[PDB]
UniProtKB/Swiss-Prot annotation, chain A:
It comes from Escherichia coli (strain K12). This is Large ribosomal subunit protein uL5. GO terms for molecular function: 5S rRNA binding; RNA binding; structural constituent of ribosome; tRNA binding. GO terms for biological process: cytoplasmic translation; ribosomal large subunit assembly; translation. One of its GO terms (cellular component) is cytoplasm. HAMAP family: Ribosomal_uL5_B (MF_01333_B). This is one of the proteins that bind and probably mediate the attachment of the 5S RNA into the large ribosomal subunit, where it forms part of the central protuberance. Its 5S rRNA binding is significantly enhanced in the presence of L18. In the 70S ribosome in the initiation state was modeled to contact protein S13 of the 30S subunit (bridge B1b), connecting the 2 subunits; the protein-protein contacts between S13 and L5 in B1b change in the model with bound EF-G implicating this bridge in subunit movement. In the two 3.5 A resolved ribosome structures the contacts between L5, S13 and S19 are different, confirming the dynamic nature of this interaction. Keywords: Acetylation, Ribonucleoprotein, Ribosomal protein, RNA-binding, rRNA-binding, tRNA-binding. The modification N6-acetyllysine is found at residue 2. It comes from the Bacteria. Identified as a multicopy suppressor of the slow growth phenotype of an rsgA (yjeQ) deletion mutant. The lineage of its organism: Bacteria, Pseudomonadati, Pseudomonadota, Gammaproteobacteria, Enterobacterales. The gene is rplE.
Curated annotation (Swiss-Prot), chain B:
Coiled coil: none annotated. The gene is rplR. The basic N-terminus is not necessary for binding to 5S rRNA. It is however required for cooperative binding of L5 and L18 to 5S rRNA as well as for binding of the 5S rRNA/L5/L18 complex to the 23S rRNA. Keywords: Phosphoprotein, Ribonucleoprotein, Ribosomal protein, RNA-binding, rRNA-binding. InterPro entries: Ribosomal_uL18_bac-type, Ribosomal_uL18_bac/euk. Belongs to the universal ribosomal protein uL18 family. Part of the 50S ribosomal subunit; part of the 5S rRNA/L5/L18/L25 subcomplex. Contacts the 5S and 23S rRNAs. Residues 1-17 are annotated as: Required for binding of the 5S rRNA/L5/L18 complex to the 23S rRNA. GO terms for biological process: cytoplasmic translation. HAMAP family: Ribosomal_uL18_B. This is Large ribosomal subunit protein uL18.
From Swiss-Prot, chain C:
The gene is rpmG. Part of the 50S ribosomal subunit. Cross-links to the P and E site tRNAs. One of its GO terms (cellular component) is cytoplasm. Surface exposed on the 50S subunit. This is Large ribosomal subunit protein bL33.
Curated annotation (Swiss-Prot), chain E:
This is Large ribosomal subunit protein bL27. Keywords: Ribonucleoprotein, Ribosomal protein, RNA-binding, rRNA-binding, tRNA-binding. It comes from Escherichia coli (strain K12). One of its GO terms (biological process) is cytoplasmic translation. Belongs to the bacterial ribosomal protein bL27 family. GO terms for cellular component: cytoplasm; cytosolic large ribosomal subunit. The lineage of its organism: Bacteria, Pseudomonadati, Pseudomonadota, Gammaproteobacteria, Enterobacterales. InterPro entries: Ribosomal_bL27, Ribosomal_bL27_CS. Transmembrane segments: none annotated. It comes from the Bacteria.
Amino acid sequence: AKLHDYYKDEVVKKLMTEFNYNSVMQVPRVEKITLNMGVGEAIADKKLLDNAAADLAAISGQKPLITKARKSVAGFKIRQGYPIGCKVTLRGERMWEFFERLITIAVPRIRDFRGLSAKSFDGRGNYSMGVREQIIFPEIDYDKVDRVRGLDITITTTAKSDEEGRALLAAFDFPFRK
Amino acid sequence: MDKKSARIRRATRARRKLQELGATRLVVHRTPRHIYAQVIAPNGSEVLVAASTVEKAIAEQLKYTGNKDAAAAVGKAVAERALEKGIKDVSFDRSGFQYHGRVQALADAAREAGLQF
Amino acid sequence: AKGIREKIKLVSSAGTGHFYTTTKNKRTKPEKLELKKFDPVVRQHVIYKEAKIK
Amino acid sequence: MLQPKRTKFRKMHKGRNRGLAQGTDVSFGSFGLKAVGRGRLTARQIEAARRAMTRAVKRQGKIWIRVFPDKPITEKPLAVRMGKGKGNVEYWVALIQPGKVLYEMDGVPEELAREAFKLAAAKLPIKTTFVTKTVM
Amino acid sequence: AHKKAGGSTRNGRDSEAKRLGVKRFGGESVLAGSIIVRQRGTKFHAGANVGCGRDHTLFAKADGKVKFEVKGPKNRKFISIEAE
RNA sequence: UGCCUGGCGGCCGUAGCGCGGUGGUCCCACCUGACCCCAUGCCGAACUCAGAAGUGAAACGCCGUAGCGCCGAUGGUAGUGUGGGGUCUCCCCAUGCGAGAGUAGGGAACUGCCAGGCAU
RNA sequence: CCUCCUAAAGAGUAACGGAGGAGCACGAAGGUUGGCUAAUCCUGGUCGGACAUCAGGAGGUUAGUGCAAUGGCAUAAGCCAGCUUGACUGCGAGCGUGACGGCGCGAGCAGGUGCGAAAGCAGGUCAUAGUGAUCCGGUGGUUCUGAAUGGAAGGGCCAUC
RNA sequence: GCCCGGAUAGCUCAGUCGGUAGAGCAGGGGAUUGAAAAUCCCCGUGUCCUUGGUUCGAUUCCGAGUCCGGGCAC
RNA sequence: CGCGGGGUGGAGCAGCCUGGUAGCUCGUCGGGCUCAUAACCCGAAGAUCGUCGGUUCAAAUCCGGCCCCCGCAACCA
């Protein structure tokens, strides 16, 4: 709800006024949020990636893709073509609704702030909050005494520098141990 | 952005075939506020006859200049102008577009208005 | 003779006496071929059947 | 004995040493020794010469070697009937053509440098002549 | 004595098959035209020399004389024939 | 007639790249919405459809700039045909052919077609 | 039997000359429509922080290619999805190629078909390795014949072992 | 490429005329001795190979094909 | 010369056939029984597969070079 409505009126004027952009539309915008568990654990057992997707879906708000391996050699020699990761990808209303369940709920329910002290960005203006465990789930009876697994929160922006890019995000207010 | 890069790659697969077979091309182009068509001579010489949504003879009466009903208007005009110059035996060039909505409506409307492929 | 992949006969499913000959990997999948092909005797395309068996 | 550390191939055609070579002019050091006659240089000779200058010039200067021996040259075993396949690789050869500069130095006096190349050149297998850098 | 230096990995020799006959300035209908196999790059095909078999023999597709061109982006060489 | 924008070319790096400037109620991008036919191995990013305001931002066209890519003489040089010589592992002589590299210099494109706007 | 060099800028031509492989795979790894684009490194990244999955950037194929090397390819000959059986039967001008046997190549025509809106495409795999003359004998088809007439072993043709 | 004949406790065999899952030895625990070698004990495992079929129900009874072992073929 | 086999915990042997897997008996070290040692019992440790490279996602294994050990061969007048 409120995030895209807030970005529209406030974050576009704020960034325009602080950075004096050449034309208003050149304010940085929010480009897709991709989430992603990655493997978690356990290639071999080959059940758990299908359980990982069914956990991830609830807080994604869409089915996970189930990414499979490229040529691979890391913590095991995965070869190529095995199932491995998870992957989501959001934009528009789905992302703006998501970005409100982040920030409002999920971040204040992380106890020690592994989710954000100081954290730094890519080479241009994209960022990646690797959350440690389990956040919140839809209506009721959230906990089923599961098997942990955090996830990458890779949020993306159209922005030209990481110094500029953190004026964005911060205009929606960003963490209390930051 | 990068879909002018992508479109031209899709096009060239078919388009090289038609000029290499030596056949007259009904080439289409799409843009979200304009729909464009030309019949081009087989060897890239004269464009034999064309219709767009920026000529007045099409433009004045149509609700939008970039929708399927506006595509039907361009197909309807263009075929009969090609027959008046005596052109038939033309082959379709989908120019890196899908054969889908405005383009499909146009290509059917072009044959139905008269054009014999 | 050749490989471990082996020769089968694909028999026309029209009652006419005609076949194509072809090799098929029995070990990896022995799930017998259907497949449609020309039969010159009925002079039309017909399903072929089987794999050198009764 | 220098040799390439790894090559694409292990044995090689005899070839001709026909032409005249690219490094006609001294250009790192001030002056140097050029091959005048053509010939082959056996890696051991390039070594024997590097040592000779090092015994002569001592702890002054810098010595640069431009030629590098890299054509493998084969020898049949002792006492073997002809033509049971191509010989084993024995020693590495640089093919020197006329005008190829072999060695350069700088950081040393001219009179010492003329003497240093006399010692080295006596160990080489071609006639050789002292060469000076020059402006163009 | 008669001392021995032994066999080898040798060579197994070649073959012979590599290309054996381009043709020029002819008049036949479907002459082989350029049997430069193993390519479609060394030569490419256009006009009535749209041949280009499933070995890249660039046979003439109607009667003529072979022009040879170098054409377009990437500068490929093309066989096309002038009709006789 | 000219200037500018778009499609199809020709030639296919002197045509490219970089760097800077610059253009938007013709047009083109981006653009919003996804209802609906359509569509995503999840994702309206892509594809597709329906369209107002917005912006020239990114893309792209245009211009300037030689930093780079790129073209490049003449002369000499290598090589070779034929014929001849010799100190013959190779080089000379006669005369025909004559590079590659490198130097001067050129260099930021020329141009046909139909299509729209603006000025004349 | 294939590929590179020797091989002399058309033919590619020897030597117990230099260097590598093949004796198959494939019912999709074939057809066709449609879409898409690589190795590698960096930077950010919940434990593989040497290397999974992710996002961003540089690069511009340095990759891919069922398997060897050479040629090849972005309109992809690469990678993915949908429908599918043209891995068709009859021929076949014209031809490269070889002493011959033989091997390669193929517009187009006739039948019937698949894919695609259509043009068009398709007669195996991006090409060159993946082989076996003839006799003999086997299985199935075919009025073609079948030693007095009629039938039948048998023989022929065709498919194939 | 035929006719045969087998395909189970880990093994060989077999209670298995279709109404119904075992002997011999293999691994763990208990019970005794200069631990042991060696007594005695209680568990050891199968949709009888994959598919057809008779039938009131049947693996085996009647059948088609994969793999092993034995003959004659070529 | 040449051909083929071998190079494993401190010892002797196994695994080596397009491959991911370290096993046995001795010896060793710690604990135990015994007056004490022997033996006997229990527990543990020990090989980055001769060495260098290559192919491979992965190599002790397959491939190539070198050193080292063994078997056979190195004649015919």
